[PDB]
Amino acid sequence: IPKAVYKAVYAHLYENASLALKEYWRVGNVPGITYVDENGKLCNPTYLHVNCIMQSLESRGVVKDTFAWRHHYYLLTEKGEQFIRKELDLTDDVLPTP
Amino acid sequence: VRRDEENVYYSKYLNDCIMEAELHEFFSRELVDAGYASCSLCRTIDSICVIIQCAEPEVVMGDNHYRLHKIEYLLAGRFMCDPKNFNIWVDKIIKRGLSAEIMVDNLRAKLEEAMPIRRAAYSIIRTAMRAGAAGCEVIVAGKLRAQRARANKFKEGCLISTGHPKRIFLAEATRHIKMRQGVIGVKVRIYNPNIRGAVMPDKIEIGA
Amino acid sequence: DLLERNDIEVRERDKYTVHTLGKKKNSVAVAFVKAGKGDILVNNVPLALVRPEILRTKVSEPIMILGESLFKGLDMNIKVAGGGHVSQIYAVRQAISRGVLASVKDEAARSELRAKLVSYDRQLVVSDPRRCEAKKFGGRGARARRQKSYR
Amino acid sequence: MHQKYTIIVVGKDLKLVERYVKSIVKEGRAFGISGPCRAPVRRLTITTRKSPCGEGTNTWHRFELRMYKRTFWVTCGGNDISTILSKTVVIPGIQVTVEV
Amino acid sequence: SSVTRVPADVFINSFAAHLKNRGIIKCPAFTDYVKTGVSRQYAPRDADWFYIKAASVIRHFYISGSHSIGVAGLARKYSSLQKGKTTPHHTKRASCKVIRSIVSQFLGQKLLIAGERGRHISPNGRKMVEDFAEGLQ
Amino acid sequence: MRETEFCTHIAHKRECRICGNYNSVYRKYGLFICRRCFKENAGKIGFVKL
RNA sequence: GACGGAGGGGUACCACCAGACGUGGAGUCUGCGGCUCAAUCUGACUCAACGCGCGCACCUCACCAGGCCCGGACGCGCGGAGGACCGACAGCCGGGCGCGCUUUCGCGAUCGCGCGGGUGGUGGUGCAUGGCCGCUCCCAGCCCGUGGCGCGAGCCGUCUGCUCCAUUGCGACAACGAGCGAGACCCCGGCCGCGGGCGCCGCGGGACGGCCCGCGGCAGCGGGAGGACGGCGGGGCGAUAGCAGGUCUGUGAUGCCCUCAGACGCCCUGGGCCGCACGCGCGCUACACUGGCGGGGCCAGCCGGCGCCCGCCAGGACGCGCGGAGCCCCCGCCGUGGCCGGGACCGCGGGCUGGAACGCCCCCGCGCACCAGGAAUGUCUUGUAGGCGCCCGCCCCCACCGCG
């Protein structure tokens, strides 16, 4: 599973402070998350890959999710906000956009 | 006279109705401490306004309103709408006791605090009666400290049971409180004849 | 077919003094009456030539009881939609009776003419209230029910 | 300028839609807003068995979602009707759409 | 008007003889041995049926006026039940080719003119239909 | 490899929103809600009785 | 309290009178039991199981015979970035898939292992439960405060009178005031105004046992009327107390047990659920002349697209913006013959949908029972029964089904 895919998930988390994921089979992979491959165009991380990273973050507690109507509803935790800042080389000056 | 039948506008209205119901469930799950009761969408030209009737606004707001901000972007992402364009406006609801949805939440917490079922139910009943409900009824059902299932119903005052007025004058809220032995489902029914908007059909006000 | 606004759409103006409506079993007839030679037309067709050949006397029944001379001097344009053939024959006799009576209006002659029709056939000038009943779950029929296998 | 802007009000509740009608007619009455054109009600219906299982005499819950739609005709300057939308009373859960 | 004053059946039968005498339509004679409509089972026994169908189809296009009804709509006017099956019988449309052949002859004859969507009766054809009707009266 | 043996398409996999259940999707107005799932959520959609 | 082949009242076409229209007989459709199976996944069995758990080629799908991985998070001891892991060409095996094998090139903690702990499961237990529904009950009944009676269980109110669809009322009354259900309410319909209008669709009225005549303290009762409409027009909602009714296989509803990388996870191919000595439950089509068969007329409503050309139809191609039943009526024909009634079967063939028929449609054959159904049994009082079409739900296609 590519490291750049992990980076985009953290990047989305600072950008939106949240993430919404659905099911195992890929419908346009995950629409709404985009990464650029070096020789590739804007590309979508696979639903399978995004699920693995966010679940790993959730056990440590980077995000907290509520499941309603077949959709995960992750919300960034304070511990997660600290983690995302280390991941994207950001600082205490930066706050999530919302 | 000639009209095409595509009428995609009817579909647009319906899709939002299903979206409102996906919001209701998601609000109830994450914001149980807040005391959230009901949700509606203004759905303005290009912008989404959600007005949530709720027992306490500040807990939903958050420090620097950060909690609300994350929720606005989570919903905007899920419903594929502009982030921040989505704005939720929390409204404190007065007469908390009358709002059945806040009262099942309070009873569910008391039952998880291990309050005795009679003690917890009576506490919910008095708060509704003080808020002016003519009748408050709480029913707790499941394996109450027994492997056999009972259904203890605690009720005070006058509560209507049938008719269209049940839709207008009766707030029926259902919870599924979870205990170690097994699910204990609680229903709180609160009846207010004076809800301002309408009068009881049977009651005749008469005159001097 | 269902109570649509299509009164003037078939015929433009023509000094139609009255626009009566006769309705039987989900069938409505808008009848337009003007001074004429005693001609009556239904669905752009002579009234005498109507589809239920047996029920072609029912259509002409109000003319017979009231009298041909009273009918003479009137031209009626009737458009029937909805319902089915027998109701459309009942709707047009009702529409003709109501419309011819409208010419007398509140007159003592109208009261006699309404009574004259009401005596030969009552409800000739009065709508029949019966309407279809809905199918209810557990029965193919509105009131019929499925056969009980046991008991 | 002078084009025709079609307002369509789609609402589940009749009293709510009638209220939107009153505000729209009042704001545009000066602008020659047309009287409400009421659409044939869209009585979308789902009939489902009341029981989760198949036990019991089969019973049916007859659910009907009636959608009431009013089409509005105003011919005038576009900027005025954009403001007219702000002026008309906002009903939550009721939608208006303008089509030229 | 006119075609209404003469009963519909007394016009269609006389018009069938007229449309065989004037040489209008001309039976394809390849559709002569075919049965109109999947719905039926034994085929027309008239043998002059094409002419009856041809006179009936012009009379429909005359009363349609500017409605300009299509050939598929005319096939739904000759639809009947498909009876003879254990499964309950339902209405089944008439053969499109037969009616398409009839409307094609009228367009070539100029009795009927082509129009947006379906074709409609031409003024030249209407003249023939109303003169025949008044002549029967 | 694994991908060629993973979720190959044989037909549409349609589920009731809220239940994730293939049976009784009831997509009459594109409302993919289960027959049972719909009765719990009818008030929210606004569907009403006589 | 329950029961009574106890009495007195009532009451209901889920009961009968009086009638209707059926089932049972048959051929089919389709469930259930039994049988057979590799598997024929199961639920449940009087009412209150049996076209029920909303349309099974795959998916659904839970079952059978092979297969593929991780989607075992996180945290520790340990190992580990020049190799934790992970990918594969060609042959070879294998329906198959570096799936493995031979082999010899890739890749980079995406970390391995052990342990602890997960994530799941259409797996069990509905007699561990929630919720929901069915049933008692198409019932009219259920009950509280204060006072009275008994040691009390428990009575009175809450009536053995009358009335009513109905604790619906009235007249009473150790009861006196309440409340719930009933009614009111709500949706629809029919009738009349007013306003609007791409489209008939928004707001009101009207009917209340009011009038009249008899009979009745009364509550009402029987008529007569007028009046679209007459005395519960049809529905929605549904008391109290329960069932050890049903659903854990609708559900991030869920206790506990099982399972838990040789998976009961999740997928992938093939096959079953649809088999069938047979018994039974819905249905469907018939048994003909009040009928069949040919042309012609042509009539809706929940609600609703079409044209042109080709093809026997079925269907297709190419486009665009639209649009409509049977029965019945009318004229012929056959004509009491298992006949042209009926259409089961069965042989070519033409289409369709899908990845793929075993699904469906259609053409020429082919021509089964059945000539009115025993003992039994069911539904129904006006726009009702019955006949006759049509739409929608599920749905690739498909209704003899359900809901309209």
Short mmCIF file of all heavy atoms in Angstrom, two decimals, chain C residues 51 53 83 85 88 130 133 135 138 140 143-144 148-149, chain G residues 283 297 299-300 329 379 381-382 384-385 401-404:
data_model
loop_
_atom_site.label_atom_id
_atom_site.label_comp_id
_atom_site.label_asym_id
_atom_site.label_seq_id
_atom_site.Cartn_x
_atom_site.Cartn_y
_atom_site.Cartn_z
N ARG C 51 -73.30 4.80 -29.88
CA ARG C 51 -72.66 3.46 -29.91
C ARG C 51 -73.50 2.33 -29.31
O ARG C 51 -73.63 1.31 -30.01
CB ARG C 51 -71.26 3.53 -29.29
CG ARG C 51 -70.57 2.19 -29.09
CD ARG C 51 -69.87 1.71 -30.34
NE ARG C 51 -70.53 0.62 -31.03
CZ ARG C 51 -71.26 0.75 -32.13
NH1 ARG C 51 -71.43 1.94 -32.69
NH2 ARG C 51 -71.83 -0.31 -32.68
N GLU C 53 -76.39 0.66 -29.51
CA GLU C 53 -77.56 0.82 -30.39
C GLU C 53 -78.82 0.55 -29.58
O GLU C 53 -79.82 1.21 -29.81
CB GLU C 53 -77.46 -0.11 -31.60
CG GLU C 53 -76.93 0.58 -32.85
CD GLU C 53 -75.42 0.73 -32.96
OE1 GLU C 53 -74.72 -0.25 -32.68
OE2 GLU C 53 -74.96 1.82 -33.34
N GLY C 83 -65.17 7.57 -17.90
CA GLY C 83 -66.26 6.58 -17.75
C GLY C 83 -66.30 5.60 -18.90
O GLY C 83 -65.27 5.43 -19.58
N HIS C 85 -69.23 3.37 -22.00
CA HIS C 85 -70.37 3.63 -22.90
C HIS C 85 -71.71 3.80 -22.20
O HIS C 85 -72.39 4.79 -22.52
CB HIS C 85 -70.54 2.45 -23.86
CG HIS C 85 -69.34 2.13 -24.69
ND1 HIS C 85 -68.98 2.88 -25.79
CD2 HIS C 85 -68.44 1.13 -24.61
CE1 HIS C 85 -67.91 2.37 -26.34
NE2 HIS C 85 -67.55 1.29 -25.63
N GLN C 88 -71.82 7.02 -20.31
CA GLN C 88 -71.79 8.14 -21.29
C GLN C 88 -73.17 8.32 -21.92
O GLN C 88 -73.44 9.42 -22.40
CB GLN C 88 -70.69 7.96 -22.33
CG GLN C 88 -69.29 8.19 -21.77
CD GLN C 88 -68.25 8.27 -22.86
OE1 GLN C 88 -68.52 7.99 -24.02
NE2 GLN C 88 -67.04 8.65 -22.48
N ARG C 130 -73.57 7.21 -6.64
CA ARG C 130 -72.74 5.98 -6.53
C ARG C 130 -71.39 6.13 -7.23
O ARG C 130 -71.37 6.52 -8.41
CB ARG C 130 -73.49 4.80 -7.15
CG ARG C 130 -74.55 4.19 -6.25
CD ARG C 130 -75.09 2.91 -6.84
NE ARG C 130 -75.73 3.16 -8.12
CZ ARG C 130 -76.40 2.25 -8.81
NH1 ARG C 130 -76.52 1.02 -8.34
NH2 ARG C 130 -76.96 2.58 -9.96
N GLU C 133 -65.73 1.67 -5.17
CA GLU C 133 -65.11 1.51 -3.82
C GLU C 133 -63.71 0.92 -3.97
O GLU C 133 -63.52 0.10 -4.89
CB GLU C 133 -65.99 0.63 -2.93
CG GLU C 133 -65.49 0.54 -1.50
CD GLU C 133 -66.21 -0.47 -0.62
OE1 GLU C 133 -67.45 -0.55 -0.70
OE2 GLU C 133 -65.52 -1.16 0.17
N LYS C 135 -60.07 -1.28 -3.49
CA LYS C 135 -59.65 -2.66 -3.11
C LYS C 135 -58.96 -2.59 -1.75
O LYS C 135 -58.17 -1.66 -1.55
CB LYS C 135 -58.64 -3.20 -4.12
CG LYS C 135 -58.06 -4.57 -3.80
CD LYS C 135 -56.82 -4.90 -4.58
CE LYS C 135 -56.08 -6.10 -4.05
NZ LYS C 135 -55.89 -6.03 -2.58
N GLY C 138 -55.97 -8.19 1.37
CA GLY C 138 -56.58 -9.47 1.80
C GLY C 138 -57.78 -9.83 0.96
O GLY C 138 -58.37 -10.88 1.20
N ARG C 140 -59.31 -9.61 -3.33
CA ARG C 140 -59.19 -9.14 -4.74
C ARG C 140 -60.26 -8.07 -4.91
O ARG C 140 -59.99 -7.05 -5.56
CB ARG C 140 -59.32 -10.31 -5.72
CG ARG C 140 -58.60 -11.58 -5.30
CD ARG C 140 -57.11 -11.59 -5.63
NE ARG C 140 -56.79 -12.25 -6.89
CZ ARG C 140 -56.36 -13.50 -7.00
NH1 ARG C 140 -56.17 -14.25 -5.93
NH2 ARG C 140 -56.09 -14.00 -8.20
N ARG C 143 -64.71 -5.60 -1.22
CA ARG C 143 -65.29 -6.14 0.03
C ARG C 143 -65.07 -7.65 0.01
O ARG C 143 -64.84 -8.20 1.10
CB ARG C 143 -66.80 -5.90 0.07
CG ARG C 143 -67.20 -4.43 0.06
CD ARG C 143 -67.95 -4.07 1.32
NE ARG C 143 -68.56 -2.75 1.26
CZ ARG C 143 -69.79 -2.50 0.85
NH1 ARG C 143 -70.58 -3.48 0.46
NH2 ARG C 143 -70.24 -1.25 0.84
N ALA C 144 -65.06 -8.30 -1.15
CA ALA C 144 -64.74 -9.74 -1.19
C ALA C 144 -63.42 -9.99 -0.46
O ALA C 144 -62.57 -9.08 -0.47
CB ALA C 144 -64.67 -10.24 -2.61
N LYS C 148 -60.58 -18.79 3.03
CA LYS C 148 -59.81 -19.24 4.22
C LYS C 148 -59.52 -20.74 4.08
O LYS C 148 -60.48 -21.52 4.02
CB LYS C 148 -60.58 -18.96 5.50
CG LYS C 148 -61.03 -17.52 5.68
CD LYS C 148 -60.98 -17.07 7.12
CE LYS C 148 -61.56 -18.08 8.08
NZ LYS C 148 -63.01 -18.28 7.89
N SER C 149 -58.24 -21.11 4.02
CA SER C 149 -57.83 -22.53 3.86
C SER C 149 -58.23 -23.36 5.07
O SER C 149 -58.73 -24.48 4.88
CB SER C 149 -56.34 -22.60 3.67
OG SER C 149 -55.66 -21.97 4.73
P G G 283 -57.99 -17.93 -3.41
OP1 G G 283 -58.80 -16.89 -2.67
OP2 G G 283 -58.71 -19.23 -3.70
"O5'" G G 283 -57.46 -17.31 -4.79
"C5'" G G 283 -57.56 -18.09 -6.01
"C4'" G G 283 -56.30 -17.90 -6.82
"O4'" G G 283 -55.35 -18.94 -6.48
"C3'" G G 283 -56.44 -18.01 -8.34
"O3'" G G 283 -56.86 -16.79 -8.93
"C2'" G G 283 -55.01 -18.36 -8.74
"O2'" G G 283 -54.17 -17.23 -8.81
"C1'" G G 283 -54.59 -19.30 -7.61
N9 G G 283 -54.84 -20.70 -7.90
C8 G G 283 -55.59 -21.57 -7.15
N7 G G 283 -55.65 -22.78 -7.66
C5 G G 283 -54.88 -22.70 -8.81
C6 G G 283 -54.59 -23.70 -9.77
O6 G G 283 -54.95 -24.88 -9.79
N1 G G 283 -53.79 -23.20 -10.79
C2 G G 283 -53.33 -21.91 -10.89
N2 G G 283 -52.58 -21.61 -11.95
N3 G G 283 -53.60 -20.97 -9.98
C4 G G 283 -54.38 -21.43 -8.98
P G G 297 -63.22 0.78 -36.64
OP1 G G 297 -62.15 1.70 -37.17
OP2 G G 297 -62.71 -0.39 -35.84
"O5'" G G 297 -64.27 1.62 -35.75
"C5'" G G 297 -65.39 2.25 -36.42
"C4'" G G 297 -66.58 2.25 -35.50
"O4'" G G 297 -67.04 0.89 -35.31
"C3'" G G 297 -66.32 2.76 -34.08
"O3'" G G 297 -66.42 4.17 -33.95
"C2'" G G 297 -67.42 2.04 -33.30
"O2'" G G 297 -68.67 2.68 -33.46
"C1'" G G 297 -67.43 0.67 -33.97
N9 G G 297 -66.52 -0.29 -33.37
C8 G G 297 -65.41 -0.84 -33.96
N7 G G 297 -64.77 -1.69 -33.19
C5 G G 297 -65.51 -1.70 -32.02
C6 G G 297 -65.31 -2.44 -30.83
O6 G G 297 -64.40 -3.24 -30.57
N1 G G 297 -66.28 -2.15 -29.88
C2 G G 297 -67.33 -1.28 -30.06
N2 G G 297 -68.17 -1.15 -29.02
N3 G G 297 -67.53 -0.59 -31.18
C4 G G 297 -66.59 -0.85 -32.11
P C G 299 -65.10 6.36 -27.52
OP1 C G 299 -66.24 6.89 -28.32
OP2 C G 299 -64.25 7.32 -26.78
"O5'" C G 299 -65.62 5.32 -26.43
"C5'" C G 299 -66.27 5.76 -25.22
"C4'" C G 299 -65.81 4.93 -24.04
"O4'" C G 299 -65.60 3.57 -24.49
"C3'" C G 299 -64.46 5.32 -23.47
"O3'" C G 299 -64.44 6.46 -22.60
"C2'" C G 299 -63.99 4.03 -22.79
"O2'" C G 299 -64.44 3.81 -21.47
"C1'" C G 299 -64.64 2.95 -23.65
N1 C G 299 -63.67 2.22 -24.49
C2 C G 299 -63.90 0.87 -24.73
O2 C G 299 -64.91 0.34 -24.25
N3 C G 299 -63.02 0.17 -25.48
C4 C G 299 -61.93 0.78 -25.97
N4 C G 299 -61.09 0.05 -26.70
C5 C G 299 -61.68 2.16 -25.73
C6 C G 299 -62.56 2.83 -24.98
P A G 300 -63.42 7.72 -22.87
OP1 A G 300 -64.26 8.91 -23.13
OP2 A G 300 -62.39 7.31 -23.85
"O5'" A G 300 -62.71 7.92 -21.46
"C5'" A G 300 -61.63 7.07 -21.03
"C4'" A G 300 -62.03 6.33 -19.79
"O4'" A G 300 -61.95 4.90 -20.04
"C3'" A G 300 -61.15 6.55 -18.56
"O3'" A G 300 -61.60 7.66 -17.80
"C2'" A G 300 -61.39 5.28 -17.76
"O2'" A G 300 -62.56 5.36 -16.97
"C1'" A G 300 -61.56 4.23 -18.86
N9 A G 300 -60.35 3.47 -19.15
C8 A G 300 -59.49 3.62 -20.20
N7 A G 300 -58.50 2.76 -20.21
C5 A G 300 -58.73 1.98 -19.09
C6 A G 300 -58.05 0.88 -18.54
N6 A G 300 -56.93 0.37 -19.07
N1 A G 300 -58.54 0.34 -17.41
C2 A G 300 -59.65 0.86 -16.87
N3 A G 300 -60.39 1.88 -17.30
C4 A G 300 -59.87 2.41 -18.42
P C G 329 -73.65 -6.96 -26.36
OP1 C G 329 -75.07 -7.18 -26.03
OP2 C G 329 -72.80 -8.09 -26.81
"O5'" C G 329 -73.63 -5.81 -27.46
"C5'" C G 329 -74.58 -4.73 -27.39
"C4'" C G 329 -74.16 -3.63 -28.33
"O4'" C G 329 -72.76 -3.33 -28.14
"C3'" C G 329 -74.25 -3.96 -29.81
"O3'" C G 329 -75.56 -3.83 -30.33
"C2'" C G 329 -73.30 -2.93 -30.40
"O2'" C G 329 -73.90 -1.65 -30.43
"C1'" C G 329 -72.18 -2.91 -29.36
N1 C G 329 -71.06 -3.81 -29.68
C2 C G 329 -70.17 -3.45 -30.70
O2 C G 329 -70.36 -2.38 -31.31
N3 C G 329 -69.13 -4.26 -30.99
C4 C G 329 -68.96 -5.39 -30.31
N4 C G 329 -67.92 -6.17 -30.63
C5 C G 329 -69.85 -5.79 -29.27
C6 C G 329 -70.87 -4.97 -28.99
P U G 379 -65.15 -16.94 5.08
OP1 U G 379 -64.27 -16.39 6.12
OP2 U G 379 -66.45 -17.54 5.45
"O5'" U G 379 -65.43 -15.80 4.00
"C5'" U G 379 -64.35 -15.15 3.31
"C4'" U G 379 -64.86 -14.57 2.02
"O4'" U G 379 -65.36 -15.66 1.19
"C3'" U G 379 -66.06 -13.65 2.14
"O3'" U G 379 -65.83 -12.32 2.62
"C2'" U G 379 -66.62 -13.71 0.73
"O2'" U G 379 -65.89 -12.92 -0.17
"C1'" U G 379 -66.44 -15.18 0.39
N1 U G 379 -67.64 -15.99 0.68
C2 U G 379 -68.67 -15.96 -0.24
O2 U G 379 -68.62 -15.31 -1.27
N3 U G 379 -69.76 -16.72 0.09
C4 U G 379 -69.93 -17.50 1.22
O4 U G 379 -70.97 -18.13 1.37
C5 U G 379 -68.82 -17.48 2.12
C6 U G 379 -67.74 -16.74 1.83
P U G 381 -71.01 -7.47 1.93
OP1 U G 381 -70.56 -6.06 2.01
OP2 U G 381 -71.05 -8.30 3.15
"O5'" U G 381 -72.44 -7.46 1.23
"C5'" U G 381 -72.63 -6.88 -0.07
"C4'" U G 381 -74.00 -6.26 -0.18
"O4'" U G 381 -75.00 -7.29 0.05
"C3'" U G 381 -74.29 -5.14 0.81
"O3'" U G 381 -74.93 -4.06 0.14
"C2'" U G 381 -75.26 -5.77 1.80
"O2'" U G 381 -76.15 -4.82 2.36
"C1'" U G 381 -75.98 -6.78 0.92
N1 U G 381 -76.58 -7.90 1.66
C2 U G 381 -77.46 -8.71 0.98
O2 U G 381 -77.75 -8.54 -0.19
N3 U G 381 -78.00 -9.73 1.72
C4 U G 381 -77.75 -10.01 3.05
O4 U G 381 -78.32 -10.97 3.58
C5 U G 381 -76.83 -9.13 3.68
C6 U G 381 -76.29 -8.12 2.98
P U G 382 -74.35 -2.53 0.17
OP1 U G 382 -73.35 -2.37 1.26
OP2 U G 382 -75.51 -1.61 0.11
"O5'" U G 382 -73.59 -2.42 -1.22
"C5'" U G 382 -72.88 -1.22 -1.57
"C4'" U G 382 -73.38 -0.69 -2.89
"O4'" U G 382 -73.84 -1.78 -3.72
"C3'" U G 382 -74.52 0.33 -2.83
"O3'" U G 382 -74.13 1.55 -3.45
"C2'" U G 382 -75.66 -0.34 -3.61
"O2'" U G 382 -76.41 0.57 -4.39
"C1'" U G 382 -74.91 -1.32 -4.51
N1 U G 382 -75.71 -2.49 -4.91
C2 U G 382 -76.26 -2.48 -6.17
O2 U G 382 -76.12 -1.55 -6.95
N3 U G 382 -76.98 -3.60 -6.50
C4 U G 382 -77.19 -4.71 -5.71
O4 U G 382 -77.87 -5.64 -6.14
C5 U G 382 -76.58 -4.65 -4.42
C6 U G 382 -75.88 -3.56 -4.07
P U G 384 -68.36 -1.50 -6.18
OP1 U G 384 -67.27 -0.51 -6.15
OP2 U G 384 -68.61 -2.28 -7.42
"O5'" U G 384 -68.13 -2.55 -5.00
"C5'" U G 384 -68.59 -2.29 -3.67
"C4'" U G 384 -69.33 -3.49 -3.14
"O4'" U G 384 -70.76 -3.27 -3.28
"C3'" U G 384 -69.08 -4.79 -3.89
"O3'" U G 384 -67.92 -5.48 -3.44
"C2'" U G 384 -70.34 -5.58 -3.56
"O2'" U G 384 -70.25 -6.19 -2.29
"C1'" U G 384 -71.41 -4.50 -3.57
N1 U G 384 -72.11 -4.36 -4.86
C2 U G 384 -73.04 -5.32 -5.19
O2 U G 384 -73.30 -6.27 -4.47
N3 U G 384 -73.65 -5.14 -6.41
C4 U G 384 -73.43 -4.11 -7.30
O4 U G 384 -74.07 -4.08 -8.35
C5 U G 384 -72.47 -3.15 -6.87
C6 U G 384 -71.84 -3.31 -5.70
P A G 385 -67.02 -6.40 -4.45
OP1 A G 385 -65.87 -6.92 -3.67
OP2 A G 385 -66.77 -5.65 -5.71
"O5'" A G 385 -67.92 -7.68 -4.75
"C5'" A G 385 -68.16 -8.66 -3.73
"C4'" A G 385 -69.14 -9.69 -4.22
"O4'" A G 385 -70.38 -9.03 -4.58
"C3'" A G 385 -68.75 -10.43 -5.49
"O3'" A G 385 -67.89 -11.54 -5.26
"C2'" A G 385 -70.09 -10.89 -6.03
"O2'" A G 385 -70.55 -12.08 -5.43
"C1'" A G 385 -71.00 -9.72 -5.66
N9 A G 385 -71.23 -8.76 -6.75
C8 A G 385 -70.93 -7.43 -6.76
N7 A G 385 -71.27 -6.81 -7.87
C5 A G 385 -71.85 -7.82 -8.63
C6 A G 385 -72.41 -7.82 -9.92
N6 A G 385 -72.49 -6.73 -10.69
N1 A G 385 -72.89 -8.99 -10.40
C2 A G 385 -72.80 -10.08 -9.63
N3 A G 385 -72.30 -10.20 -8.40
C4 A G 385 -71.83 -9.02 -7.96
P C G 401 -52.66 -14.57 -10.16
OP1 C G 401 -54.12 -14.53 -10.36
OP2 C G 401 -51.82 -13.48 -10.68
"O5'" C G 401 -52.39 -14.64 -8.59
"C5'" C G 401 -51.40 -15.53 -8.05
"C4'" C G 401 -50.46 -14.79 -7.13
"O4'" C G 401 -49.29 -14.36 -7.87
"C3'" C G 401 -50.97 -13.50 -6.52
"O3'" C G 401 -51.80 -13.64 -5.38
"C2'" C G 401 -49.67 -12.83 -6.10
"O2'" C G 401 -49.18 -13.26 -4.85
"C1'" C G 401 -48.73 -13.22 -7.25
N1 C G 401 -48.61 -12.15 -8.25
C2 C G 401 -47.80 -11.05 -7.96
O2 C G 401 -47.18 -11.02 -6.89
N3 C G 401 -47.70 -10.05 -8.87
C4 C G 401 -48.38 -10.12 -10.01
N4 C G 401 -48.26 -9.12 -10.88
C5 C G 401 -49.23 -11.23 -10.32
C6 C G 401 -49.30 -12.21 -9.42
P G G 402 -53.04 -12.61 -5.07
OP1 G G 402 -53.98 -13.24 -4.07
OP2 G G 402 -53.68 -12.16 -6.37
"O5'" G G 402 -52.34 -11.34 -4.38
"C5'" G G 402 -51.79 -11.48 -3.05
"C4'" G G 402 -50.78 -10.38 -2.83
"O4'" G G 402 -49.83 -10.37 -3.92
"C3'" G G 402 -51.35 -8.95 -2.82
"O3'" G G 402 -51.71 -8.54 -1.51
"C2'" G G 402 -50.13 -8.13 -3.24
"O2'" G G 402 -49.30 -7.81 -2.15
"C1'" G G 402 -49.42 -9.06 -4.21
N9 G G 402 -49.71 -8.75 -5.60
C8 G G 402 -50.42 -9.51 -6.50
N7 G G 402 -50.50 -8.98 -7.68
C5 G G 402 -49.82 -7.77 -7.56
C6 G G 402 -49.59 -6.76 -8.52
O6 G G 402 -49.96 -6.73 -9.70
N1 G G 402 -48.87 -5.71 -7.97
C2 G G 402 -48.43 -5.63 -6.68
N2 G G 402 -47.75 -4.52 -6.35
N3 G G 402 -48.63 -6.58 -5.78
C4 G G 402 -49.34 -7.62 -6.28
P C G 403 -53.13 -7.89 -1.27
OP1 C G 403 -53.43 -8.01 0.17
OP2 C G 403 -54.07 -8.45 -2.27
"O5'" C G 403 -52.89 -6.35 -1.63
"C5'" C G 403 -51.83 -5.61 -1.00
"C4'" C G 403 -51.44 -4.42 -1.84
"O4'" C G 403 -50.86 -4.86 -3.09
"C3'" C G 403 -52.58 -3.53 -2.30
"O3'" C G 403 -53.01 -2.63 -1.30
"C2'" C G 403 -51.94 -2.78 -3.46
"O2'" C G 403 -51.20 -1.66 -3.02
"C1'" C G 403 -51.01 -3.83 -4.06
N1 C G 403 -51.54 -4.42 -5.30
C2 C G 403 -51.35 -3.73 -6.50
O2 C G 403 -50.73 -2.66 -6.49
N3 C G 403 -51.83 -4.26 -7.65
C4 C G 403 -52.49 -5.42 -7.62
N4 C G 403 -52.95 -5.91 -8.78
C5 C G 403 -52.70 -6.14 -6.41
C6 C G 403 -52.21 -5.61 -5.28
P G G 404 -54.54 -2.20 -1.26
OP1 G G 404 -54.93 -1.86 0.16
OP2 G G 404 -55.37 -3.28 -1.90
"O5'" G G 404 -54.61 -0.88 -2.19
"C5'" G G 404 -55.48 -0.89 -3.35
"C4'" G G 404 -54.86 -0.07 -4.44
"O4'" G G 404 -53.88 -0.88 -5.15
"C3'" G G 404 -55.78 0.42 -5.56
"O3'" G G 404 -56.46 1.63 -5.23
"C2'" G G 404 -54.76 0.68 -6.66
"O2'" G G 404 -54.03 1.87 -6.45
"C1'" G G 404 -53.88 -0.55 -6.52
N9 G G 404 -54.37 -1.69 -7.27
C8 G G 404 -54.80 -2.89 -6.75
N7 G G 404 -55.20 -3.73 -7.67
C5 G G 404 -55.02 -3.05 -8.86
C6 G G 404 -55.28 -3.47 -10.19
O6 G G 404 -55.73 -4.55 -10.58
N1 G G 404 -54.97 -2.47 -11.10
C2 G G 404 -54.47 -1.23 -10.79
N2 G G 404 -54.23 -0.40 -11.81
N3 G G 404 -54.21 -0.84 -9.54
C4 G G 404 -54.52 -1.79 -8.63
#
